[PDB]
Design a binder for this molecule. Structure first.
Ligand SMILES: C/C(=N\NC(N)=[NH2+])c1cc(N)cc(/C(C)=N/NC(N)=[NH2+])c1
Ligand SMILES: *[C@@H]1O[C@H](CO)[C@@H](O)[C@H](O)[C@H]1NC(C)=O
Ligand SMILES: [Ca+2]
Ligand SMILES: [Ca+2]
Ligand SMILES: [Ca+2]
Ligand SMILES: [Cl-]
Ligand code: NA
Ligand code: NA
Ligand code: NA
Ligand code: NA
Length: 472
């Protein structure tokens, strides 16, 4: 194997780096994995299918125009070049290699399509028809859209889009499950907290945050417990950015934000799926948990969980490591079927006031077919009233002592509407035994005399009862 000769490949520091601050993609390429046979689709504003660095890998079967209801996802050209984003994301995954044009994709022999679905009124039906496009042909979907990143919205998929997620992971990809790769948000400046985004907060999406070139948390990042891992993206003006295909058959060195991180992850997942085409949607999340790397990512909240893995709310389990992903995939044993243990916690409503703590010792469905000794995702599904939602901070502590932030204070969230069975999700107790005492903390972070009531707390545990590794 010879590394790409493309003119901008040297500028793709997050791939071609020689200084341990990269995604370790060359190591996967050298193992023989480049994305051959894998199909990725970018759900965004369209794809310039005739781009000189995309045409060779373009797949009409991975593509559709939901906004105009036709097969052709070509972007709408405007003098502001508004509809360039999907083309930029597509090139991150699968720009052609060794062709004298721009740089390369992470999975530069994968097939790449795009769904034109953001350039219009984005309804529940539009989202559902995009997520559910050709699910026995497309393996991996990449998306970075969702509710406004204003730091005051709580919203997620409505009914059709949620049904698309459950159909995708259940029957998609021959029953192995569609892999939905998602950006965790861009609301950092607004102090947004990304479990309030039901798309990234879903267990069915493999959620990705960003790190800057120097290993820091970028200005736009949102912290939350639902994030799984990290890829490099943009930062300050001394830090390099993402280099990829641009609208009008050009090449950009200034692709930015968490929306540039999700496509890089989708490309790494494509290499991993080439290494083992039988991986399920849950297998893929397990591989990410086991192989991602905290080293040299700076955050003040790195904490060791119950099985010895370091986790951060900014970074999840750390930076994706493509070489490690493809190596571990090859002989991976399929995880056992997913169990779900439902524990209704409260016997009476609880006044929140200044601070509320709810402690409950659980057996995690001991003696039942849904007995879980090996956690994957956990949710605290909360229904509560409060007079100013953004003054609340919410934490959940597992029996092993792992403190997951379910909600950080959001200064712009003045809503009086509370949470209506909102399923705050954490990945930070993955592989822990969930038997024992769980603790829910709700606190008023302001000096104001705020008031409200917690009326429902359902602890929902997902996972299995076999196959644990020795703790890290
Ligand atoms: C709000 C949002 N993401 N929010 C989130 N991820 N929580 C987002 C992200 C990106 N990349 C595009 C659009 C567009 C062009 N939306 N265009 C439309 N709705 N017509 C919205
Ligand atoms: C895929 O995994 C399932 C479950 O372990 C197994 O039954 C099946 O034989 C595997 N298929 C291939 C082609 O490896
Ligand atoms: Ca069209
Ligand atoms: Ca190229
Ligand atoms: Ca957000
Ligand atoms: Cl479920
Ligand atoms: Na909506
Ligand atoms: Na919605
Ligand atoms: Na997710
Ligand atoms: Na710990």
């Amino acid at each position: 194997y010879q590394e790409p000769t493309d003119p901008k490949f040297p500028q793709q520091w997050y791939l071609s780096g020689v200084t341990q601050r990269d995604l370790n993609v060359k190591a996967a390429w050298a193992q023989g994995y480049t994305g051959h046979g894998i199909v990725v689709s970018i759900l965004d504003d369209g794809i310039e299918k005739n781009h000189p660095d995309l045409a060779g890998n373009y797949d009409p079967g991975a593509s559709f125009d939901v906004n105009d209801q036709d097969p052709d996802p070509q972007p709408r050209y405007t003098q502001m070049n508004d509809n360039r984003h999907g083309t930029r994301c597509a090139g991150e995954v699968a720009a052609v290699a060794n062709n004298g044009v721009c740089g390369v994709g992470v999975a530069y022999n994968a097939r790449i399509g795009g769904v034109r679905m953001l350039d219009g009124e984005v309804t529940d039906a539009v989202e559902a028809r995009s997520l559910g496009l050709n699910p026995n042909h497309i393996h991996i979907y990449s998306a970075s859209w969702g509710p406004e990143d204003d730091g005051k919205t709580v919203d997620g998929p409505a009914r059709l889009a949620e049904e698309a997620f459950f159909r995708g992971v259940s029957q998609g990809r021959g029953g192995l499950g569609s892999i939905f790769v998602w950006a965790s948000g861009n609301g950092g400046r607004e102090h947004d907290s990304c479990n309030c985004d039901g798309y990234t907060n879903s267990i069915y999406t493999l959620s990705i945050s960003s790190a800057t070139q120097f290993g820091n948390v970028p200005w736009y990042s949102e912290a939350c417990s639902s994030t799984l891992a990290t890829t490099y993206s943009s930062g300050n003006q001394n830090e390099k950015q993402i280099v990829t295909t641009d609208l009008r058959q050009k090449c950009t060195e200034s692709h930015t934000g968490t929306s540039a991180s999700a496509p890089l992850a989708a490309g790494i997942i494509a290499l991993t799926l080439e290494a083992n085409k039988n991986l399920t949607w849950r297998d893929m999340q397990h591989l990410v948990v086991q192989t991602s790397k905290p080293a040299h990512l700076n955050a003040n909240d790195w904490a060791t969980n119950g099985v010895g893995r370091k986790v951060s709310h900014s970074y999840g389990y750390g930076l994706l490591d493509a070489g490690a992903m493809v190596a571990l995939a090859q002989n991976w044993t399929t995880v056992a079927p997913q169990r779900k243990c439902i524990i209704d916690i409260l016997t009476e409503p609880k006044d929140i006031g200044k601070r509320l703590e709810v402690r409950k010792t659980v057996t995690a469905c001991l003696g039942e077919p849904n007995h879980i000794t090996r956690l994957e995702h956990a949710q605290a599904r909360l229904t509560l009233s409060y007079n100013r939602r953004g003054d609340l901070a919410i934490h959940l502590v597992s029996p092993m002592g792992t403190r997951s932030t379910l909600l950080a204070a959001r200064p712009h969230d003045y809503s009086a509407d509370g949470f209506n069975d909102w399923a705050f999700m954490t990945t930070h107790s993955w592989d822990e035994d969930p038997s024992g005492e769980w603790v829910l903390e709700i606190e008023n972070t302001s000096e104001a005399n705020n008031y409200g009531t917690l009326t429902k707390f359902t602890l929902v545990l997902y996972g299995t009862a076999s196959g644990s590794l020795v703790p890290r």
